[PDB]
Every structure is written in structure tokens, then in C-alpha cells.
Amino acid sequence: MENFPTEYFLNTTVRLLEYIRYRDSNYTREERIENLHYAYNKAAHHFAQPRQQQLLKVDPKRLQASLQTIVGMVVYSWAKVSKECMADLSIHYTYTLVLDDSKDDPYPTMVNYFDDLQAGREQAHPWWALVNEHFPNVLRHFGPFCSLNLIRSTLDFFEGCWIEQYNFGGFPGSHDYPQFLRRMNGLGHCVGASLWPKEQFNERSLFLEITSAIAQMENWMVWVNDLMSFYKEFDDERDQISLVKNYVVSDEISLHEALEKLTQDTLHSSKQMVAVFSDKDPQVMDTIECFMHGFVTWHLCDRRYRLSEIYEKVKEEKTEDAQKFCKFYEQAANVGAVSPSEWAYPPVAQLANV
Template sequence: MEISTEQYRGVLIDFLEAVEYEEPDCDTDSVMQQRIGDLAFVYSGTVGHFLEPDSRQLLVAIEEQHLLAVIRTVTRMVALSWQGIPQPVMLTLSIHFTHFVLGDDSREDPSRLMENFVPDLLQGVQQSHPIWKSMFSFFPEVLGHYGSFLQITMLNSILDFVQACWIERWRSGATPGSAEYPMFLRRLSSLGTFCAATLFPSSKIDERENFEDITTALAHFIPIVALINDLFSFYKETKEGEEDESIVGNICTAEGVSVEQALRKVSEDSVRACQTLDQVLRDSGSGTIADTVSSFIQGYIRWHLCEERYRMEDLADAPGENAVKFRLFRNLACKAGGVRLVDFTQLTPATVPQNTLAYLERTPGN
């Protein structure tokens, strides 16, 4: 990549300091026990869903080891970021987000299977694309936990995501001078409003009573979700030769700037988005919504720092003057995320907790 490891780590450190990332509860036994329980519940339940015969037959082209790796990633994301929502809601989100990652990871040209996507969707006909077929079949289970306005929000975000996957298969990057393109694509692909909407299940938040604050959060969430991910995923993308397709690569091409300048822009924009939303919600007197959003952002950063998919361990171990400082941030996230306390290899369908099994038995398709 056209930026040194030292420079890249410096960008991440500056971001973490700007958002004042910390984990004050990582030494609290009750918090960690709840987190460990959430990780175990969500992982085992998600595995149970996708290894069920009908699901495996539908997604037969996806290797089981890749599927399990995706489930580990999604489990950590949901359990660490959506902290405080009921476990059954976490489980439905994990199953749904697994479809998103599988769709994003796919390198097949989707156009052949998308000719009737819109008519089939409007007429209630099952989709031809196997991943979207599986996803939309399960989607009602997610919707059942949310109010009607948030249901529409989630559907809209999903359609944006499907469109973004299509764009990313058909073109390799931005056109020089097209300054609006990088964020246009990220607005489609980020699932930002989906993430925001799913923070407010009906069992926890009344969407009618909190409508103004919820829609305020929706308005600000896309750059938060998109840009934090872009910032932390860049290292992985450079190792896998995908940096030209990232928002950083698109900014470099569209605006003619260096990699470090593009990363700094992403970092500064994400910090501004986080701080602005928090300030707006606090000023409006919405402590509950503000605390929910703040908890998500903290957990979302935690997940990126300790998630194996993003290779932050390799980045922390690489030599350099700022390695120790970055390693302290990562070790803190790993401790708070229970990384060494949950052995996913021991959580097979045979060890699924009884309350997870009971929930899955009520879920269509299982």
C-alpha cells in the first residue's frame, strides 16, 4: 500500500483518541458474563440455523469453513455492538447479517439471477439468487421485533445494499474527477440506516414516542457505520489486493489525493459524525437514545479492533514506534470483547443452549 504501517497505525490511533475510546466496564464481572453469554447464544444459534439441512441445500455453493468464519465475524459484531438488546433479537440480526456478508463476499456476476428481482419481490415470489432467497425468507423474523416505520427503513437499506453489491461486481472503482461517487457507493453498501433502525426493537424502545430522536439517528448513521468500517478494514484490503475498490481507493482516484490524505479524510469525517450525533441527541434531552447510540459506537469500534477478519493483531505486532500504543488499544478491546474467553470451536449445534433451541424451533425454516 502507498502508506507505511507506521502512518496507518498513526491514523487509527488519532481516531481512537479523538473519539475517546475506552472500556471502563471490562473489569466488571457482570458485564463480561453477559457478554460471554451473548457471544455463546448468538454463535450457537446462528450455526444451528445455517447448518440446518434446508439452509445448507440452498447455500450449497458456500464452503462450510467459510460459512463458519463469517458466522464468527458476525457473532462478534452483533454481540459486541448491539449490547443491551434481548438475545433473541441479537440472534435474528446475526442470521440476517450473515447473509449480508455472504452476499458481499460473493464474486459472482449477479445480473443473471436478478432479472426478475423487483417483480418477484413485489409479488411475494421467492428470489432466484440463493443468498437473497435465503435472506428474504428469514427477513420477517427480524421485522417482527420492530415497529412499522423501522421495518420500512430496514427494507430500504437492504435494497440499497443489494444494488451496491451489483455495482461492485460490474465496475472496479471511481472515475477520476467523480468526487461524489465514493460516498454514493458507500451510502448504498453501508447498511447504516439498517444498523441504526435495529438498535431500537419494540421491546426496548417505542418508535412512536421516540420518533424524532430515532429519525435524527437515522440521518447521521451512514457515515458512522460506513467510515469506521472503511478506516479499520483498509489494512485487510491492502493485504488482499482490494484497496482500489475501497472508499479510500475511490477517494484517491476521484479526488487525486494520497492514501494518507484519503484515510485522514475518512477518519476526520467519521469522528465528526460520531461527535455531532452525540451532541445533537444530548442537547435534545434524549438520554436513552443517545446512550444507545454511544454504546453501539463503542462496541462497533471494539469489534473492529479485535475481529480477526481485519488483521488488527498483525498490525499491532508489526514493528514501529507507535506499535506499543496501538497494541494497548487493541488489547483493551480484546479484553472487553471476551476474545480469549469464548471458544467458538466448542460451540457446535450439539451444545446449543436450550433457550436457543426453543427459539429456533419457533423460527420458520428450522
């Protein structure tokens, strides 16, 4: 199909939003902007420090854009946490997105990973040096259990990026590969566990609800990111691997059948997320609900996903799905579409030369 499944894509997206009850929040634009600027400002000063500028090899423009996309993701989906927590998570998730830009083989820098770690010597891989040095700022907002989940998920992520340098979709017939990889690079347990600051949640008292949230949120969060990204990756000949593309290669099926699997898995996860938490601790279901809505709003408003294009193509159309979609899209824009000039300034590079 040299043609993007617009009708199909519209149907699945709409059903998703209905399933989760995509709606309005008491999260006002003024509030969004206060948080966006706050998280961005702290993170920008952090990455402009000389040490960060030195060990972190990233093109300034790509770093600028990666940060802006992460602050938006965190401020929008982690609506219930403090400003400091939004800012610290913003730094952490920016480090993870940036590692994706590296092509350097980790092998030589991991030869002594364990012994250095055990001995307390700075890690040879500069990414780990920066990330572990900064980790305490993130972990101070959480209890021991949630902290362990963040630490594990970030280690899994490092391995995920190592594996991806091989641009490997999986051996035909290796059915377990696709999801094995998506979970490795998903940060599912990092996200899931980072939603529960010890400041407003008691880890020990809500252990079972948190653990369940982590387990269920892992798959929802990544599957939704895959679905929403399916448009920008469709004609991207540079990106050769993804959950859907690997389904195609590893399971030996069509892109349509791979998209079908993703869409069914995504809806089943949404339906079950609601069915499980719609009657547990209120604050928990609130964080969970704000995350699902925020996450979707972020995908719809960030130009990285180019969803404005699909909107603009079915803007004036009589079909049911199209209208439902546009209304949703329009909703998101009302609270989500904010000019970067209102919060993302000054540029990281500017603060860097100072």
C-alpha cells in the same frame, strides 16, 4: 508509500477513541460469552438446515468464519438488545456478508424481480429466497418505521454487491461515486434502525431521535469500518476497491490525501455524534454509546482486521500516541479477546451432516 502510515494511523485512531470516550462497560466477560454462544448457537442451527445448506452457496469454512465474525460484531455493538434479537440480527448480517462471496451475475435472476415480488412468488435469486423467507424473524423485533429502514438498506446492499462485481473505482472526475457506493453497500440504515427494538423503545415517541441517529450513525459506522480496515487492505492486492481507493481514483488524489479525507470525516462525525446525543433520552444515548464502543472493540479484537500486528509493532515505544493506543488496545482485549472455543461450537458443518 510502500509503507503503512503507522504514526499517522496511530494519531487518528487515538483521537477517534478520545472523541467517543472509548471506555469500560458493565458488560462483563461472562455476559459476553453467554450472548456470543446464544447468538452463535441459534444462527449455527439455522444455517445447518438442509434448505439453507442448499441454496446458500458458500464454502463451509468461509461460512463458519463469516458467522463467527458477525456474532461478535452484533453481540459487542448491540449490547442493549435481547438475546433473541442478537441472534436474529446475527443471521441477517451473516446473509449480507456471505453475498459478498458471490461472483454470479444477478442480471438474469432480477429480470422478473418486481413481478414475482408483487405476485408473492419466491424470488429466482436464491439469496433473496432465503433472506426474504427469514426476514420476519428480524422484523418482529421492530416497529413499521424501523422495519422499512431495514428492508430498504438490505435492498440497497443487494445493488451495492451487484455494482461491485464490476470492480469499478469510478471514472476519474466522478467525485460523487465513492460515497454513493459506500452508502449503497454500507447497511447504514439497517444498522442504525436495528438498534431500536420496539420492546424497549417507542418508535413514534422517539421518531426524531431515531431518524437523527440513523442519519448520523450511517456515516460514522461505515467511516469507522473503513478506517479500522485500512490496515488489512493496505497491502491486499486482491481488494481493488474501497472508499479510500475509490477516492484516489475518482478524485484523482493521493492515498495520503484520501486517507486524510476519511480521517477528517470520521472525527467530525464522532465529535458531532457526541455533541448531539449527550443530552437526549438517556436510554437512546446509552444504546448509541454502547454501539460506538462495541463496534470499536470488535474491530480491535477480531483477527480479521489484524490490528494485533500494529499493536505488536509499537508495543514498547515511548511516543505518546503509541502508548495511548496500546492502553486502548489492551483495554479492548481485556473484555473483548475471547477464545472461540468458549462459545462458537459445534461447527456449522457438524450440525449440517446430522
